[PDB]
């Protein structure tokens, strides 16, 4: 319960500097810091003092990361630059100095964090920021390794659907449900779902005029009626859909629907009909990761349904 | 002290003032539940000397 | 020095005789009182009298 060491970073005159990030280097007993003056400082922990002081770039560092050997330390700024600082070469570790070895920019907007992993399998650092994409780079050969830029949008969990019946499309974001009919293209509706407060996780409509929205907390159901260039909607109700969670929703018909819930529980309603399943054994990885043994995908034919769960396991359900 | 009191001491107080009044039983029960903090031996002896003084 | 002693003694007199006077005196409580309700209808229908 004591604070026994205090160091001050070199100050800026027109501002109030602040040290954005710190990190501990265990090979040679140091702590590294990245500070809004735009500096990277290497302090030796014992004796609580300064070995190295670099002006890295214009503006405030935000994150630091290291390899295991403490031979490479990578700084991630806000002015979009990644710096690689090196100590691996012999005389360099022998005298415990550091080197502003390399710098490089790849992000579009700016950087917010960096985290590195290394192993015989692979050796990469991960930079994530504001431009809604993550870049993966080589820890061993940062001046040589070629980047990868994994992009913003990933449709694994889709947030839009289309009904060829009356030839329209429906997209949803945070409590927002915008519809458009095509012919030119004209919007139809707009559903800020005033009630819920989460991102809508599974919403679907069948061939026709039914609609359902679902969240793992509560779910809701609607009926639509075309009133012309506009439509009107009504809020149908069932306590079961009010209370139960929904990983996945599908339509058998315009009256019958099926529901998959995070406890891997499936229900069917005709607008408490439940149907059995096949259990899964647990291994060491099954103990570790909880969600892998949870149902991953649900699909339905006119009658039959298929369930896929993380073990690659695939099963068939006849309602 | 408030501890070394038995039914023999009860009959001894009966030979003294009165047990038929029940006071012997009263004091033995209050001593069994006694809440006054027990004190130094030397205080017991000198205070006993004091009591002998006032009695004489 | 003697003047300081005199004055400070009077000041102590007045100070603690004040504190006695206060301790026997009483004030009036002016503190906020927010009530808990579990339903908006009960909120609306609330009356402290009832």
């Amino acid at each position: 319960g004591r604070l026994l060491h205090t160091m001050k970073v070199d100050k800026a005159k027109k501002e109030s500097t602040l040290v954005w990030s710190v990190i501990y280097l265990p090979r040679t007993d140091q702590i590294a810091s990245g500070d809004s003056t735009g500096s990277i400082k290497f302090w030796d922990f014992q004796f609580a003092t300064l070995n190295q002081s670099f002006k890295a770039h214009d503006a405030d560092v935000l994150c630091l990361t290291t390899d295991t050997d403490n031979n490479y330390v990578f700084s991630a700024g806000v002015d979009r630059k990644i710096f690689q600082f090196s100590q691996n070469t012999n005389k360099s570790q022998k005298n415990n100095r550091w080197v502003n070895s390399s710098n490089r920019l790849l992000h579009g907007n700016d950087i917010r964090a960096i985290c590195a992993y290394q192993s015989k399998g692979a050796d990469f650092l991960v930079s994530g920021g504001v431009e809604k994409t993550l870049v993966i780079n080589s820890l061993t050969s940062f001046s040589n390794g070629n980047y990868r830029k994994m992009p913003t949008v990933e449709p694994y969990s889709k947030n839009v659907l289309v009904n060829k019946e009356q030839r329209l499309v429906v997209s949803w974001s945070e409590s927002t449900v915008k519809i458009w009919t095509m012919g030119n293209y004209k919007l139809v509706c707009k559903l800020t779902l005033k009630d819920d407060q989460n991102i809508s996780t599974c919403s679907l409509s069948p061939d026709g005029q039914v609609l359902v929205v679902g969240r793992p907390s509560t779910t809701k159901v609607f009926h639509l009626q075309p009133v012309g260039n506009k439509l009107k909607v009504t809020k149908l109700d069932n306590d079961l859909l009010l209370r139960t969670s929904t990983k996945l929703v599908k339509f058998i018909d315009n009256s019958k629907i099926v529901i998959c819930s995070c406890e891997d529980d499936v229900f069917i309603v005709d607008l408490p009909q439940e149907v059995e399943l096949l259990e899964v054994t647990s291994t060491k990885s099954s103990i570790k990761v909880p969600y892998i043994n949870r149902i991953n995908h649900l699909e339905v034919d006119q009658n039959i349904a298929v369930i896929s769960r993380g073990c690659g396991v695939v099963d068939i359900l006849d309602l | 002290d408030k501890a070394s009191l038995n039914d023999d001491s009860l009959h001894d107080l009966a030979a003294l003032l009165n047990e038929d009044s029940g006071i012997a039983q009263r004091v033995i029960d209050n001593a069994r539940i006694s809440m006054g903090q027990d004190i130094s031996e030397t205080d017991m002896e000198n205070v006993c000397v004091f009591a002998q003084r006032v009695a004489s | 020095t003697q003047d300081s002693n005199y004055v400070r003694t009077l000041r102590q007199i007045e100070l603690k005789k004040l504190e006695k006077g206060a301790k026997q005196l009483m004030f009036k409580s002016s503190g906020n009182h927010t009530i808990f309700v579990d339903s908006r209808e009960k909120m609306n229908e609330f009356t402290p009298e009832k």
Partner: protein, 51 residues
């Protein structure tokens, strides 16, 4: 309480009467109080007894 008090008091603690009289009429304070009979003072001599 007795340790709660400071030094000058434990000096003056006896002759509080003459102390307060001196204070309320601007004469000069007493000096011994109860610690007179302390053997140390009991061998001291005069101004030395005070010190």
């Amino acid at each position: 309480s007795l340790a709660k008090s400071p030094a000058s008091t434990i000096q003056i603690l006896g002759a509080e009467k003459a102390l307060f009289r001196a204070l309320k009429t601007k004469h000069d304070t007493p000096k011994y109080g109860l610690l007179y009979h302390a053997s140390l003072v009991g061998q001291a001599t005069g101004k030395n007894k005070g010190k």
